[PDB]
Ligand binder design. Structure first.
Ligand SMILES: O=C(O)CCCC(=O)O
Ligand SMILES: O=C(O)CCCC(=O)O
Ligand code: SF4
Ligand code: SF4
Ligand SMILES: [Ca+2]
Ligand SMILES: [Ca+2]
Lengths: 611, 611
């Protein structure tokens, strides 16, 4: 067996039992890795479990690309049943832990149970142990990783959670190297519910490879294709930050709880303001086009900036100064919570406060009051902070404000306002983990321009586009698992991936093999959702926030414009038609059979009727 | 089996293998523990090994008294074939690591082999792992323990080495809780040769006790006896620091490399001075008469003072200010090196400079120069720091300065000058592990007074009092293992020890049983020494330094007075007669049998002729 090890590391924090599970090579070929392997595990071992209970499974999954020198192939998926959405959840993050876990001899690490006291998992090749992390509990993500490296060395990958993960904030995440995050859907809350403060990994093994020479040829070429791409220079300069100006110009910039797609102070928080505030640039393992742009915030501290971070904590909050948005950004990072869901919950609170619904709380443009709430959420302090720490869906039900609750399936909407973008909106509505642009960032295509550098329409081909993209971004790249930006941003030929896959594993994968493998994962995940919800499911699940229907842009040539229900409903049906799902968004027995997901039928039939 | 677990933890740094060896109940009954158990182990497992080679065994041996609430019973022994002496070496220190080791289900821990990189041993009950310490190597013992506690919490026992151990300074020791130390013969240099930086222990298990009620009552009774003894108030004030004045009053205070027994500036480095420089008081686990007195040094740094540290690093160096001696004290502690051997090796250099044998180096009184040499020794900087790091015996061989080399068997002499004290001289000459006062601090009885508050004679009864003292100090107390000071200083009845042992292990030990056990340990160790010295051995190995025979006190009414070789030789013969040894200091066959050491005879018989 090449590329894959065929081994999964298992740790039971309740019994302290540690073992290695071997899985069949055909499971490897079938799901490839990352989100593929993660969905397989959660389907079998996370049936009906309470998201914050010890029975839920915290999965750290890499793919055949990880552990090896591959173009930006230092990513890693973190999956578990989501405490926020209640369905399947996962996220991705770059980290040397990805490299170590795999050189250590594992394709994945599954964690179950819950320790009696704060602990952290230590892995050094075959030497794996559960140690006390009692002295760490309470410390930021930055400090925890720092102290751990001060004991074990620099040659390690470290995953940690901040006070927000410990306090179980629904959108808490897992951090690494003061900047990389993963698990918007509560993966950090799960890691916290298990009394797991961190994971430290070091691996020195040689990962078996089918064609060593071709792996080197391909990698060198792909690396050089990046270096020589026309978009490399501007990418190096602004990274994902270039989307601020791009979204504003196109009215896709979330402003004041997505009330508008235009922000008057966008200049004071864009890639050009960022550029003049930069003091350092970091990146993920094996990446030659780093985009972890570090600036200094209004308090002299370092903040690693990303577009979604700034849009959600900046324009979305009505804050027009980047060094102040940078302060909030850093907090989210050390407290260990999702910048996106955190910004949407705060933005939600500001609107509600302004509407007279909430009596105490910050308003838009209120940096200080926003900074106090971000911290109050991190430590669940007081009534207001504890509520917002539950997310907008939960918060909405309590405050009775479904009106301006920007989420889909329970996950807060990303940094793209879609009042006039059917495809991107469909993208958000159909995301396998909930509202996210992860799997399908189609607004760029739908518009015709890209940050690296209009008449609405619900054309059926858009649903086809959203599906093709999801195969690549929500499928291939999440199973490899490598970075999509090289391809997305600087245009690296995708033809490199099936070839690298064949060089590493020895197995030929055609593009159809991949779309199928990708579609298999999408349906299995959709099935997991349905089963967990006990059959209570239908198309509305796949609907975008209702605000994009009842109101429209508040300024610009498209003022007043929004999305149309009837036409969106058809776009979706078309989507379901392509995927092979009924008008409830549930996969059909024929489709599941097609994708080798037969074993899923008996389980779903017990909760609803299949077609 | 009660009291003892009959279990020994084995860690092989080389192969990483970790197991638990079960040892008989007669072996426990026979050797009781601590030093007893360590000698049995070293005899069998460290046969012909290089003290600094991977084959050497690093032992952390506890005893029936450890892990349980026994009066000042938080001690622990550290043993291994000595790098400085080449014979059996060991030390003792008070540390929570003594309690936690036993509460984890082990009587002792035996490290063997050598890690391929800086590592530390982690123990939490049955969970034992060899972790990376690459980020710790190079840091002071103080910093190492603080950092590990910041990770695993305060509720643990940590044992560490400083750069002196790391660099293999021959008199390198193991440190704990900033101040507590063990292993003068270079236990720290053995820990370092294994690339072992520390040991973190935590125990929660409940130890099997034959009579739980008796143990309680006996202990409650022992503590009160301590609390009410007349010497308690003063002991709380000066600890062992009261020995400076008393030693100066008796011409026993080592001054300028043992050149004299009186120091004109003894007052500014005495217990009353210390008393007015005290900012904190610490102690070992389970002791109600703490004696770790903390002063602020010349540099404002906390320093834990003990008589021996101040005597060999102060008056012995000719340094008369206590805040300056404390500085050298702290350095010893944080670098991980025995204050005694460090001070004697330095004084030796100082005397060597003054006499012009050495062209460079500090002189008596030169604090700045002594501090620099001390730091140069720990880091082995320069020809001088390097030579001095070898100890006076080796240094002397190099400089040809055998005349003022204050050691016996390679181990440097303690803080008691014996120009006119035949018993104490015999104590140093026969100390099992080489020159030390641990096993026989007879000088107080020989004078008729003690610090807690003269005619030279060689009465053969002096050889008896030494053996008697050794049975208790170098035996019982190193086997239990508990602190001897509550008995020595405040006078707690020695009758609690046989009853407590009985209440713990269930066995009834009579004082003759104990005297026999201690004697077994003594003949075994001598056996070890002779065997490892390849039969090359004679009575001179038990002789005190030449200086005390060919020179005398330089001041006071005893001016000019010294020791008579002939009359000492006679005292040694009485010692050998009592112990049942030949005129060569080697145990006699009938003696070995008598002590159940028959298995020693065939082995020694291979290197010399027995009697
Ligand atoms: O700006 C973003 O958040 C998305 C970057 C492009 C991509 O999602 O691949
Ligand atoms: O002052 C010392 O160093 C010795 C204290 C008494 C003893 O050794 O038991
Ligand atoms: S492009 Fe950015 S996110 Fe992707 S691997 Fe490189 S540094 Fe990481
Ligand atoms: S008397 Fe001193 S050395 Fe003995 S146990 Fe107490 S604090 Fe420790
Ligand atoms: Ca980031
Ligand atoms: Ca001390």
């Amino acid at each position: 067996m090449y590329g894959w090890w065929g081994r999964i590391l298992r740790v039971n924090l309740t019994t302290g039992e540690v073992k290695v599970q071997e899985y069949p090579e055909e499971v490897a070929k079938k799901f490839i890795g990352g989100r593929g392997l993660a969905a397989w595990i959660l389907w079998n071992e996370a049936r009906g479990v309470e998201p914050l209970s010890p029975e839920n499974k915290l999965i750290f999954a890499a793919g055949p690309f990880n552990g090896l020198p591959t173009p930006s192939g230092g990513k890693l998926v973190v999956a578990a049943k989501s405490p926020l959405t209640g369905g399947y959840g996962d996220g991705n993050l770059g980290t040397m832990a990805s490299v170590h876990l795999r050189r250590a001899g594992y394709d994945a690490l599954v964690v179950e149970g819950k320790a009696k006291k704060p602990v952290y998992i230590y892995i050094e090749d075959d030497n794996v142990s559960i140690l006390s992390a009692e002295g760490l509990w309470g410390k930021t993500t930055f400090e925890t990783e720092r102290e751990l490296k001060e004991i074990h060395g620099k040659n390690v990958g470290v995953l940690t959670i901040g006070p927000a993960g410990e306090n179980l904030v629904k959108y808490a995440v897992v951090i690494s190297q003061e900047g990389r995050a993963a698990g918007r859907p509560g993966m950090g809350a799960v890691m916290g519910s298990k009394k797991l403060k961190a994971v430290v990994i070091r691996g020195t093994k040689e990962i078996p490879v089918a064609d060593k020479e071709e792996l080197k040829k391909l990698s060198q070429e792909a690396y050089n294709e990046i270096l020589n791409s026309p978009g490399y220079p501007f990418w190096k300069r602004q990274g994902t930050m270039a989307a601020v100006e791009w979204c504003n110009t196109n009215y896709a910039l979330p402003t004041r709880n997505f009330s508008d797609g235009y922000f008057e102070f966008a200049r004071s928080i864009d890639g050009y303001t960022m550029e003049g505030m930069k003091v350092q640039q970091r990146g993920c393992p094996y990446c030659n086009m780093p985009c972890g742009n570090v600036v200094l915030d209004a308090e002299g501290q370092e903040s690693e900036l990303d577009y979604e971070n700034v849009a959600l904590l900046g324009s979305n909050l009505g804050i027009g100064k980047l060094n102040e948005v940078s302060v909030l950004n850093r907090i989210a990072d050390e407290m260990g919570m999702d910048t996106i869901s955190l910004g949407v919950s705060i933005a939600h609170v500001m609107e509600a406060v302004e509407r007279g619904i909430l009596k105490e709380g910050p308003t838009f443009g209120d940096f200080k009051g926003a900074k106090q709430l971000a911290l109050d959420i991190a430590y669940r302090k007081g009534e207001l902070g504890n509520l917002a720490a539950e997310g907008v869906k939960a918060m909405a039900e309590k405050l009775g404000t479904h009106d301006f609750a920007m989420h889909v399936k329970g996950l807060e909407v990303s940094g793209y306002n879609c009042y006039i973008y059917p495809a991107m909106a469909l993208a958000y509505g159909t995301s396998a983990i909930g509202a996210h642009h992860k799997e399908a960032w189609v607004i760029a295509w739908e518009i015709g321009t890209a940050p690296i550098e209009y008449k609405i329409s619900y054309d059926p081909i858009k649903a086809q586009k959203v599906v093709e993209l999801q195969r690549l971004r929500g499928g291939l790249f999440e199973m490899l698992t490598a970075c999509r930006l090289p391809w997305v941003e600087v245009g690296l030929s995708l033809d490199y991936y099936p070839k690298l896959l064949k060089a590493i594993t020895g197995v030929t994968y055609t593009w159809d093999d991949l779309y199928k493998a990708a579609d298999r994962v999408y349906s299995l995940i959709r099935a997991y959702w349905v089963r967990e919800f006990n059959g209570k499911w239908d198309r509305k699940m796949d609907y975008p926030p209702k605000r994009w229907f009842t109101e429209g842009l508040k300024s610009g040539p498209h003022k007043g414009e929004h999305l149309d229900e009837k036409k969106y409903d058809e776009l979706l049906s078309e989507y379901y038609r392509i995927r092979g799902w009924d008008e409830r968004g549930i996969p059909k027995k024929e489709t599941l059979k097609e994708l080798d997901l037969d074993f899923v039928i008996p389980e779903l039939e017990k909760v609803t009727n299949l077609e």
